[PDB]
Amino acid sequence: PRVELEIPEDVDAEQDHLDITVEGDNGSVTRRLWYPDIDVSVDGDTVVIESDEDNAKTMSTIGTFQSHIENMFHGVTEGWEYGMEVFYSHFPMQVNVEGDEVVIENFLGEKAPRRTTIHGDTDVEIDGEELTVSGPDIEAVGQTAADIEQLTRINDKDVRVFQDGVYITRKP
Amino acid sequence: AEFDADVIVDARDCIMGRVASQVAEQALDGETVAVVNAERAVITGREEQIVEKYEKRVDIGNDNGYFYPKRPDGIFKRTIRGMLPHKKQRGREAFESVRVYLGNPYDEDGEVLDGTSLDRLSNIKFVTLGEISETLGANKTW
Amino acid sequence: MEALGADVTQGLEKGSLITCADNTGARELKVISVHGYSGTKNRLPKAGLGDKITVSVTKGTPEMRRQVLEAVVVRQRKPIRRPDGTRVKFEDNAAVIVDENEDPRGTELKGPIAREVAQRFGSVASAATMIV
Amino acid sequence: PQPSRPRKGSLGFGPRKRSTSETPRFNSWPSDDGQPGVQGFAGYKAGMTHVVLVNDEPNSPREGMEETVPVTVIETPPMRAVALRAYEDTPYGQRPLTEVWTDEFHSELDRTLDVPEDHDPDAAEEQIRDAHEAGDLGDLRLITHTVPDAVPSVPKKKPDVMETRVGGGSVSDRLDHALDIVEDGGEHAMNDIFRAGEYADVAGVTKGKGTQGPVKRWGVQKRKGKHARQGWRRRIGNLGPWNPSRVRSTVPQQGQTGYHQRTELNKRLIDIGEGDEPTVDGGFVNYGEVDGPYTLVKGSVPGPDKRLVRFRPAVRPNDQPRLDPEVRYVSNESNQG
Amino acid sequence: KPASMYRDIDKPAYTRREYITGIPGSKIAQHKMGRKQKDADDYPVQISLIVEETVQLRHGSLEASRLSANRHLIKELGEEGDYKMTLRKFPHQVLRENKDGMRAAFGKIVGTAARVQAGEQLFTAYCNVEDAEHVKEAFRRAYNKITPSCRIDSSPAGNA
RNA sequence: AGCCUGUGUACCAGGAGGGGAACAACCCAGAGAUAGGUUAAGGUCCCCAAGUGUGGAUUAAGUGUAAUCCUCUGAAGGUGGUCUCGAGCCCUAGACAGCCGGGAGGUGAGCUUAGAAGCAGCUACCCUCUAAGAAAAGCGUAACAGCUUACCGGCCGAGGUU
RNA sequence: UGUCCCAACGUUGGGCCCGGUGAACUGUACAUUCCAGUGCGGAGUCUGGAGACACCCAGGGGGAAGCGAAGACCCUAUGGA
RNA sequence: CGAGUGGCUUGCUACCUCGAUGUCGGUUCCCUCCAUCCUGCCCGUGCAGAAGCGGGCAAGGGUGAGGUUGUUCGCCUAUUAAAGGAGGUCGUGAGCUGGGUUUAGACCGUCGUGAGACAGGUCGGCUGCUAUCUACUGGGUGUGUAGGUGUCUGACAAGA
RNA sequence: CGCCACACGGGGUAAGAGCUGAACGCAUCUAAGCUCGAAACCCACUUGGAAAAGAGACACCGCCGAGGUCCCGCGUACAAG
Ligand SMILES: [Cl-]
Ligand SMILES: [Cl-]
Ligand SMILES: [Cl-]
Ligand SMILES: [Cl-]
Ligand SMILES: [Cl-]
Ligand SMILES: [Cl-]
Ligand SMILES: [Cl-]
Ligand SMILES: [K+]
Ligand SMILES: [Mg+2]
Ligand SMILES: [Mg+2]
Ligand SMILES: [Mg+2]
Ligand SMILES: [Mg+2]
Ligand SMILES: [Mg+2]
Ligand SMILES: [Mg+2]
Ligand SMILES: [Mg+2]
Ligand SMILES: [Mg+2]
Ligand SMILES: [Mg+2]
Ligand SMILES: [Mg+2]
Ligand SMILES: [Mg+2]
Ligand SMILES: [Mg+2]
Ligand SMILES: [Mg+2]
Ligand SMILES: [Mg+2]
Ligand SMILES: [Mg+2]
Ligand SMILES: [Mg+2]
Ligand SMILES: [Mg+2]
Ligand SMILES: [Mg+2]
Ligand SMILES: [Mg+2]
Ligand SMILES: [Mg+2]
Ligand SMILES: [Mg+2]
Ligand SMILES: [Mg+2]
Ligand SMILES: [Mg+2]
Ligand code: NA
Ligand code: NA
Ligand code: NA
Ligand code: NA
Ligand code: NA
Ligand code: NA
Ligand code: NA
Ligand code: NA
Ligand code: NA
Ligand code: NA
Ligand code: NA
Ligand code: NA
Ligand code: NA
Ligand code: NA
Ligand code: NA
Ligand code: NA
Ligand code: NA
Ligand SMILES: [Sr+2]
Ligand SMILES: [Sr+2]
Ligand SMILES: [Sr+2]
Ligand SMILES: [Sr+2]
Ligand SMILES: [Sr+2]
Ligand SMILES: [Sr+2]
Ligand SMILES: [Sr+2]
Ligand SMILES: [Sr+2]
Ligand SMILES: [Sr+2]
Ligand SMILES: [Sr+2]
Ligand SMILES: [Sr+2]
Ligand SMILES: [Sr+2]
Ligand SMILES: [Sr+2]
Ligand SMILES: [Sr+2]
Ligand SMILES: [Sr+2]
Ligand SMILES: [Sr+2]
Ligand SMILES: [Sr+2]
Ligand SMILES: [Sr+2]
Ligand SMILES: [Sr+2]
Ligand SMILES: [Sr+2]
Ligand SMILES: [Sr+2]
Ligand SMILES: [Sr+2]
Ligand SMILES: [Sr+2]
Ligand SMILES: [Sr+2]
Ligand SMILES: [Sr+2]
Ligand SMILES: [Sr+2]
């Protein structure tokens, strides 16, 4: 099978070996697309994903390589953004960005601060009870958002009663 | 400390057991062989089950002893020993005229033996001797 | 528990017979167990100054005899070491019956108590005449 | 029901054989942080006494109060960092590359080594710096020796020699730092390395006890009750099951006990001084009198009096440092009595 | 007692009541179920449960499977649903048990079983094209209580 | 049961040599000495004589690389893991899925009930506008509200479904 | 009351080294073994691996289904008392 | 009702051993298994919390002291994070014990005309050996690598 | 029976919580990829270790003499050694 992806005019796609780099006005993203007998290449103004194999496993990855590439196109231009709201009942939760990680304090009244490191060149901006996670690499951005929500996970008590935490509000 | 090898084999991206088999065959024929870039030699399959096997060999033992190597250096050298009658004179002689190295201490480059090559573009389920050694706890001196 | 404030060489074991330093009606106590303790194979469980122990009343009034109660060791013959190095030892081994809250069951303590003990069980202390 | 019970003795300090070097040999060194600096020193054990200190622990209910603390007195006169050895990184680990020696040697270093008469410190240095340029340089260490002569209580004059790593800032800077020490004459002291109140790891060869049985050597029980009168008093039950048909090396047996190297972690240095303040009346038993550079280590130290003990900045301290503890009293009462 | 003890055909046929006494009664309550007054031809669908291996099925197993199957058909079609199912086999083989070592070992009589050759129909149902799936479920529950694997074969039924 | 007890036969016993890791009776084989040659069983990546043989396919589990067997396990049950073959039906008059838009009036059906208005129960389940739109399939409400399904239209474009 | 918790230190005689004296038990052979397997199913000796430079001193006894005694149990004998 | 795994219980068989492989229980000492009792990390709950209950990963460590009884087992007591189970010739008598079982003495009940008998009860009742080989704990002498001193490396190995 | 000392922190995982993500336009923690996550695994720490047969490295001294043995006085050592 063969699939061709016309690259956007705002974007430039370069690739050497199994790595592919995509750049736009919003930044750049490099990925490794490695799978048995699936060739990914930049043919002029289009990216080509092809293979002589056509079994269920090969077709699966081909479809995966595509979305990853289209996602890179999107991220280098429009960019990726996830929205998050910080909710707390009794204890005021302090959420702040420090260095390359967001720190949460007073979660459920805890003395020790909870924290997580931000992935990639991802940017995290907080305004009141709202957080916006954004960047070109959907992987890094997507994980960072998830990590923040996970960072307030509770296993010990009934979640229905204790709901304090930062939740993904808008998914791009 | 200098090893006049008649043959210098490059194990990079080569199937360990297939190279080992030919190096043994040649050592028995009287050739002095030096296997180079051992840390880059390869072994196929699920990294998880491959490692479970080598970890078991590391955990085996008792007073008599079952000293199993952890470095790509010795793993490979042992792989070759299991293909040589190392307890017989001719076998020990062959085994002792074979050596394995991390990286390549020679100026000349080794040759790639036919049939032992692995194409990374066509395979994803394989592991590297170096990766195995690191998992086993070896000191990545290479 | 709260640091005792001294080093103790347990001078008692399960089965040891000791004096009941109070006016509960119990005269002699037998050590059955030591609160929070867990020993090792063949080792007889040991107790010393400051430990809370389960006891059975060996000698005393009919009503008290044979009752299984909690107590606190207040004195022992085997020495203990204080922060300044000095060792301290008493004339006998004694304990005071105490309740679920660690308050002395009796109304008066008999004989001296170790400062270290008094500090750990204040209510027991707030009943002592002498505190050495 | 056959109650459980941990085994007798640790399997981590064997084989329980006689040590090869009476001089202890560290198998680890502190991490590189502060300015370059030698990561160890040495001295000779003298004896013990006690001191009274003002509690330092800011988390202690007794902070600021008198506290009696046992102390082992170690005579720590100046040592000579006589050479600079460089290690290069190779496929088979670290290997000595070369050494930079000096000219001024203590008058009796010739009781142990064949002191250099013809040496070239620059070719060596050159080779070293070239190795650094190439990026094949492994850690840097100093060949060090003690000056037994400065210690009257110790009969020997033959210096004890040990290698001590130099850690610190950047390699270029500590390499320069190393060369400085060496070239001078190598003379350095306990001060230059440790400060009272810091934690050190002490290493030494324990007191020898020759052959001892399982009870003493491994802490196994003696036979009990009636079992102690039949002909067996201090022998273990058995050497193993029917199968495996062999005696495992893990069963407690007789043999050499003592005279083994041991590295005791986190020993607090109570005080580093010089003079005879810690000395004891009548003299330390089987040692002599102290009057010179000394170090007071909190607690016990492996080895008999006179044995060579080695210090190193603790590699795994549990607590933060509380420098220069206040010593209000140092016992000088006779140790006989 | 485990079926492993009697599921194979490793003994002579033992069925002669004239020479065997004390034979326990069968646990099978009914062989013909559903509306047994109506004919089988009066149905558009005919589905049988076929045994894939030759075996012996003790009456306690025939009862459990039949019960656990008709029960479902009753629960899904009612105590009078327009269907009918037949257990076409009867436990003729008498089973023993040697319950003294191997001396005079001939066993005492303990039960009965039906011999079924692979490929045969143990059960057969007749339903309307509507309840065709309710019967397939009844059989699924039936073959779970007998030794061998089974094929749920659909005889008259070209409405798929 | 590597059990007990029959029957027929070949084998061990009393049968070498070759193979089967080893291994009385499993395979080849019945054998004077010595010599050359060709095969048998079984094998041909190395250990160890002979292929890293050819055409093709499947497997990703190190499954497997184990004729027979006390010796080699692997079952009932389950699997949108993957490959191959077949049948029915739908589709460029645009299928399947997704997304967007519409989902409307008589009329909160009648009964029951203080009330029940798709959605407690009982019964009925009809017709207008129209490209569609139930006397309502699933939540939801104290009952409404509200959220969706059916149903129609659009965007999209090639197989889809059983 | 050291039977025990829980062991310690000490005493005398041995043990250890030296001079002299100087046996016995036991010995199919070979024998540096270990892990698995196999085998008359409980192998230092067979198979596959692993380990293994030779010799000597002291030791406590895991194994040699250790040595000692043609099993006192059980059965058998057209045995004995 | 159906399908299995183990080889901890019991039974079956009579393949090994009668020119002997010393019983049970305990003790001492060592290694192991996981079908996990505690401890670590998880999932569900008829999960508010606290705590229960059920389930998953996981064998690093721990799992103790006592009363009857020879007991194994089990019952009981106070402690405990918990006081799990099992294999190693039902590990362990050329290690210990000798309470039970199982010689010769004796009594009771029952059986027998009797001698005598009875997984019925009861009191008493013997435990040999100087280690040849192997195994291991420690200690030496030589040879090999191939003039001496001093300092190291670190393949491997042990640990809870 | 007394006294002293005996980690924190990394790395990779299990169960599990998730991210991106297709086969199957959607969905999906999984098929490729990734973020986390156990007293458990590896490292950290301690102890042994040139007989590691690839039998090792460095510095200096020496080959008419460096070093060593016997001898003598002794123990921080020790059953002989
Ligand atoms: Cl080993
Ligand atoms: Cl060989
Ligand atoms: Cl692959
Ligand atoms: Cl207790
Ligand atoms: Cl004992
Ligand atoms: Cl013939
Ligand atoms: Cl494999
Ligand atoms: K016998
Ligand atoms: Mg006990
Ligand atoms: Mg004194
Ligand atoms: Mg005094
Ligand atoms: Mg015969
Ligand atoms: Mg031929
Ligand atoms: Mg060949
Ligand atoms: Mg397998
Ligand atoms: Mg006989
Ligand atoms: Mg008899
Ligand atoms: Mg007669
Ligand atoms: Mg027989
Ligand atoms: Mg014997
Ligand atoms: Mg499990
Ligand atoms: Mg709870
Ligand atoms: Mg364990
Ligand atoms: Mg036994
Ligand atoms: Mg024995
Ligand atoms: Mg005996
Ligand atoms: Mg004996
Ligand atoms: Mg008795
Ligand atoms: Mg008589
Ligand atoms: Mg009898
Ligand atoms: Mg008796
Ligand atoms: Na492979
Ligand atoms: Na090993
Ligand atoms: Na004796
Ligand atoms: Na035995
Ligand atoms: Na024949
Ligand atoms: Na053969
Ligand atoms: Na396999
Ligand atoms: Na005594
Ligand atoms: Na022995
Ligand atoms: Na089974
Ligand atoms: Na565990
Ligand atoms: Na008991
Ligand atoms: Na036995
Ligand atoms: Na025993
Ligand atoms: Na005995
Ligand atoms: Na015994
Ligand atoms: Na981790
Ligand atoms: Sr070949
Ligand atoms: Sr046992
Ligand atoms: Sr040293
Ligand atoms: Sr080391
Ligand atoms: Sr005795
Ligand atoms: Sr054995
Ligand atoms: Sr039969
Ligand atoms: Sr079935
Ligand atoms: Sr081939
Ligand atoms: Sr092919
Ligand atoms: Sr067998
Ligand atoms: Sr089979
Ligand atoms: Sr199956
Ligand atoms: Sr062999
Ligand atoms: Sr002996
Ligand atoms: Sr015999
Ligand atoms: Sr498991
Ligand atoms: Sr738990
Ligand atoms: Sr038993
Ligand atoms: Sr019982
Ligand atoms: Sr009895
Ligand atoms: Sr009797
Ligand atoms: Sr007796
Ligand atoms: Sr030689
Ligand atoms: Sr996962
Ligand atoms: Sr050497």
D85 touches strand I (CB under 7 A): yes
**What does the DSSP 8-state code read for residue D30?**
P
Residue D225's φ and ψ, nearest 5 degrees, are 55, -125
**Nearest nucleic acid nucleotide to D204, CA to C1' distance:** I76
**C3–D4 C-beta distance less than 8 A:** no
C-alpha E124/C-alpha E134 separation (Å) is: 13
Angle between helix axes B47-59 and B129-136 (nearest 10 degrees) is 50
B141 touches strand F (CB under 7 A): no
Contact D78, D151 (CB under 8 A): no
C-alpha B96/C-alpha E89 separation (Å) is: 75
**C83–D61 C-beta distance less than 8 A:** no
Q: Compare all CA atoms of chain A with the CA of B119 and give the residue at the minimum distance.
A: A36
**D62–C41 C-beta distance less than 8 A:** no
Plot region of D64 (φ>0 → left; ψ -120 to 50 → alpha; else → beta): left
Plot region of A78 (φ>0 → left; ψ -120 to 50 → alpha; else → beta): alpha
In order of D133, D231, D236, D302, the CA distances from D219 in angstroms are 55, 20, 11, 19
Length of chain C: 132
User: Hey, which residues does D69 pair with through a beta bridge?
Assistant: D51
C-alpha B129/C-alpha C7 separation (Å) is: 56
Same domain for D313 and D193? yes
Going from the Cα of A156 to the center of ligand 66, the distance in angstroms, rounded, reads 14
DSSP string, D109-140: GGGTS---SS--HHHHHHHHHHHHHHT-EEEE
C-alpha C74/C-alpha C88 separation (Å) is: 13
In the 93-132 segment of chain E, residues within 7 Å (Cβ) of strand F are 102
Place of tokens 């260095």: A99
In single-letter form, the type of residue at position B59 comes to D
Distance from CA of B101 to the nearest CA of D (A): 9
C-alpha C75/C-alpha C132 separation (Å) is: 10
D203 alpha carbon, distance to own chain's centre: 2
Q: Compare all CA atoms of chain D with the CA of B142 and give the residue at the minimum distance.
A: D91
Which residues in chain D touch residue B73, judged by CB atoms under 8 angstroms apart?
91
* CATH 3.90.930.12 boundaries in chain A: 1-79, 80-172
**A34–B124 C-beta distance less than 8 A:** yes
B116 alpha carbon, distance to own chain's centre: 13
**D93–B63 C-beta distance less than 8 A:** no
Distance from CA of B56 to the nearest CA of A (A): 30
For chain B, the domains span 1-142
For chain E, the domains span 1-160
In order of D148, D327, E58, E116, E146, the CA distances from E2 in angstroms are 86, 83, 11, 18, 12
B61 touches chain D (CB under 8 A): no
CA of B87, nearest ligand number: 2
Domain's final residue, options D232, D257, D282: D257
Question: Which positions ≥6 away from D271 have C-beta within 8 Å?
Answer: D51, D196, D295, D296, D325, D327
* CB-count exposure of residue E100 (10 Å: 0-12, 13-18, 19+): exposed
User: Hey, which residues does D81 pair with through a beta bridge?
Assistant: D144
* Structural biology method used: X-ray
B124 touches chain A (CB under 8 A): yes
Question: Which positions ≥6 away from D173 have C-beta within 8 Å?
Answer: D35, D36
Discontinuities after residues in chain E (C–N over 2.5 A):
99
In order of C67, C110, D310, the CA distances from C63 in angstroms are 8, 20, 66
3-state secondary structure of D227: helix
User: Hey, which residues does A31 pair with through a beta bridge?
Assistant: A20
Question: Which positions ≥6 away from D274 have C-beta within 8 Å?
Answer: D292, D293, D294
**B101–D248 C-beta distance less than 8 A:** no
| Right CATH for A1-79 from 1.10.10.10, 3.30.565.10, 1.20.1300.10, 3.90.930.12 | 3.90.930.12
HSE (side-chain half, CA atoms, 13 Å) at D112: 17
C-alpha E126/C-alpha E132 separation (Å) is: 9
Chains E and D, touching by 3 or more CB pairs within 8 angstroms: no
C-alpha E139/C-alpha E49 separation (Å) is: 6
**What does the DSSP 8-state code read for residue B14?**
B
Same domain for D212 and D169? no
C-alpha A93/C-alpha A139 separation (Å) is: 27
Place of tokens 């008498």: E94
**D4–C5 C-beta distance less than 8 A:** no
C-alpha A129/C-alpha D272 separation (Å) is: 58
Contact E61, E147 (CB under 8 A): yes
**Nearest nucleic acid nucleotide to D94, CA to C1' distance:** H153
**C3–D3 C-beta distance less than 8 A:** no
Nearest residue to A135 via CA among A6, A18, A24: A24
C-alpha A122/C-alpha E91 separation (Å) is: 75
Contact E157, E130 (CB under 8 A): no
Distance from CA of B121 to the nearest CA of A (A): 6
Buried b (16+ CB within 10 A) or exposed e, B98-126: bbbbbebeeeeebeebeebebeeeeeeeb
C-alpha E116/C-alpha E144 separation (Å) is: 16
Q: Name the neighbours of B, counting chains with at least 3 Cβ pairs within 8 A.
A: A, D
Helix (H) or strand (E) holding D174: helix D171-184
Nearest residue to D293 via CA among D185, D187, D161, D142: D187
Going from the Cα of A83 to the center of ligand 41, the distance in angstroms, rounded, reads 59
CA dihedral B74, B78, B81, B86 (to 10 degrees): 80
CA dihedral A8, A9, A10, A12 (to 10 degrees): 80
Contact B120, B14 (CB under 8 A): no
Residue D46's φ and ψ, nearest 5 degrees, are -110, -50
Q: Compare all CA atoms of chain D with the CA of C83 and give the residue at the minimum distance.
A: D67
The CATH fold assigned to A80-172 is Outer Surface Protein A; domain 3 (3.90.930)
Q: How far in angstroms lies nucleotide F141's C1' from the CA of residue A159?
A: 26
User: Hey, which residues does D312 pair with through a beta bridge?
Assistant: D201
Length of chain D: 337
CA dihedral D300, D303, D304, D309 (to 10 degrees): -90
| Domain around C93 | 1-132
C-alpha B45/C-alpha B17 separation (Å) is: 13
- Cis previous bond, D159, omega within 30: no
CA dihedral A50, A56, A60, A61 (to 10 degrees): -50
C59 alpha carbon, distance to own chain's centre: 16
DSSP string, D267-290: EEEEEEEEESSS--TT-BTTTB--
B76 touches chain D (CB under 8 A): no
Superfamily (CATH) of domain E1-160: Ribosomal protein L16/L10 (3.90.1170.10)
Nearest residue to D88 via CA among D15, D2, D171, D154: D171
Contact B78, B20 (CB under 8 A): no
Contact E113, E59 (CB under 8 A): yes
C-alpha D179/C-alpha B13 separation (Å) is: 45
C-alpha D304/C-alpha C77 separation (Å) is: 34
User: Hey, which residues does B32 pair with through a beta bridge?
Assistant: none
Domain's final residue, options D257, D274, D298: D257
Question: Which positions ≥6 away from A104 have C-beta within 8 Å?
Answer: A93, A94, A95, A113, A114, A115, A151, A152, A166
Distance from CA of B127 to the nearest CA of A (A): 15
**A34–B123 C-beta distance less than 8 A:** no
In order of C86, E55, E58, the CA distances from E26 in angstroms are 90, 18, 9
Which residues in chain A touch residue B123, judged by CB atoms under 8 angstroms apart?
36
Same domain for D200 and D297? yes
D66 touches chain C (CB under 8 A): yes
Residue D188 tokens read as 């350095």
Question: What's A54-123 look like in SS3?
Answer: CCHHHHHHHHHHHHHHHHHHHHHHCCEEEEEEEECCCCCCEEEEECCEEEEECHHHCCCCEEEECCCCCE
* CB-count exposure of residue D333 (10 Å: 0-12, 13-18, 19+): exposed
C-alpha D213/C-alpha D220 separation (Å) is: 9
**B122–A34 C-beta distance less than 8 A:** no
- Cis previous bond, D15, omega within 30: yes
Nearest residue to E124 via CA among E17, E3, E31: E31
Q: In terms of DSSP H, where are the helices of chain B?
A: 16-28, 47-59, 72-81, 89-96, 129-136
User: Hey, which residues does B33 pair with through a beta bridge?
Assistant: B7, B98
3-state secondary structure of A140: helix
Nucleotides of I under 7 A from a protein CB: 1-8, 12, 17-24, 31-36, 41-50, 52-62, 66-67, 76-79
Question: What's chain E look like in SS3?
Answer: CCHHHCCCCCCCCCCCCCCCCCCCCCCCCCCECCCCCCCCCCCCEEEEEEECCCEEEEHHHHHHHHHHHHHHHHHHHCCCCCCEEEECCCCCEEEEECCCCCCCCCCEEEEEEEEECCCCEEEEEEECCCCHHHHHHHHHHHHHHCCCCEEEEECCCCCC
Helix (H) or strand (E) holding D180: helix D171-184
Residue A27's φ and ψ, nearest 5 degrees, are 130, -155
C-alpha D43/C-alpha D310 separation (Å) is: 6
Strands of the sheet with B7-10, listed across from one edge: B7-10, B33-36, B98-100
**What does the DSSP 8-state code read for residue A25?**
T
C-alpha D262/C-alpha D161 separation (Å) is: 18
B85 touches strand F (CB under 7 A): yes
C-alpha C52/C-alpha E17 separation (Å) is: 79
Length of chain B: 142
Residue C46, domain CATH: 2.40.150.20
Nearest residue to C60 via CA among C29, C92, C33, C31: C29
Contact C59, C40 (CB under 8 A): no
Same domain for D177 and D278? no
Q: Name the neighbours of A, counting chains with at least 3 Cβ pairs within 8 A.
A: B
Contact D19, D208 (CB under 8 A): no
Same domain for D158 and D135? yes
Q: How far in angstroms lies nucleotide F64's C1' from the CA of residue B45?
A: 13
Contact D260, D19 (CB under 8 A): yes
Helix (H) or strand (E) holding B32: none
Chains A and B, touching by 3 or more CB pairs within 8 angstroms: yes
Distance from CA of D221 to the nearest CA of C (A): 10
Which residues in chain B touch residue D14, judged by CB atoms under 8 angstroms apart?
none
Place of tokens 């016309």: A6
In order of A47, C17, C71, C87, the CA distances from C55 in angstroms are 85, 10, 7, 27
Which residues in chain D touch residue B102, judged by CB atoms under 8 angstroms apart?
91
Strands (DSSP E) found in chain D: 37-38, 41-54, 66-75, 79-90, 93-101, 137-145, 161-167, 187-188, 199-205, 211-212, 255-256, 261-275, 292-298, 308-313, 327-330
In order of E43, E81, E132, E135, the CA distances from E38 in angstroms are 9, 12, 18, 18
Angle between helix axes B129-136 and B72-81 (nearest 10 degrees) is 110
3-state secondary structure of D315: coil
In single-letter form, the type of residue at position E128 comes to N
Residue D70 tokens read as 């046992």
In the 270-299 segment of chain D, residues within 7 Å (Cβ) of strand I are 286, 298-299
Residue D327 tokens read as 């010593």
**D91–B142 C-beta distance less than 8 A:** yes
Ligand 52 is an ion; its neighbours by CB within 5 Å are D 27
C-alpha C18/C-alpha C54 separation (Å) is: 12
D225 touches chain C (CB under 8 A): no
Kindly give the pairing relationship between strand B98-100 and strand B33-36.
parallel
Question: Which positions ≥6 away from E68 have C-beta within 8 Å?
Answer: E141, E142, E144, E145
Question: Which positions ≥6 away from C43 have C-beta within 8 Å?
Answer: none
Q: Give the angle C29-C30-C33 at the CA atoms, nearest 5°.
A: 125
In single-letter form, the type of residue at position E5 comes to M
Nucleotides of G under 7 A from a protein CB: 3-9, 33-36, 42, 44, 49-52, 58-64
Same domain for D67 and D197? yes
In order of D168, D176, D183, E159, the CA distances from D190 in angstroms are 17, 21, 19, 99
CATH class of the domain at B1-142: alpha beta
Q: Which of A19, A32, A33, A37 to mutate to test the interface with B (most CBs of B within 10 A)?
A: A37
Q: How far in angstroms lies nucleotide F22's C1' from the CA of residue B70?
A: 32
Other Cβ atoms closer than 10 A to C47 = 28
Contact E131, E76 (CB under 8 A): yes
| Domain around D144 | 78-188
Start-to-end Cα distance in chain A: 30
CA of D232, nearest ligand number: 34
Q: Compare all CA atoms of chain C with the CA of D63 and give the residue at the minimum distance.
A: C83
Q: Give the angle B103-B107-B109 at the CA atoms, nearest 5°.
A: 70
C-alpha B72/C-alpha B80 separation (Å) is: 12
In the 56-75 segment of chain A, residues within 7 Å (Cβ) of strand F are 56-57, 60
Q: What's the number of domains chain C is made of?
A: 1
Other Cβ atoms closer than 10 A to A8 = 17
Q: Is the dihedral of CA C81, C87, C88, C90 positive or negative?
A: positive
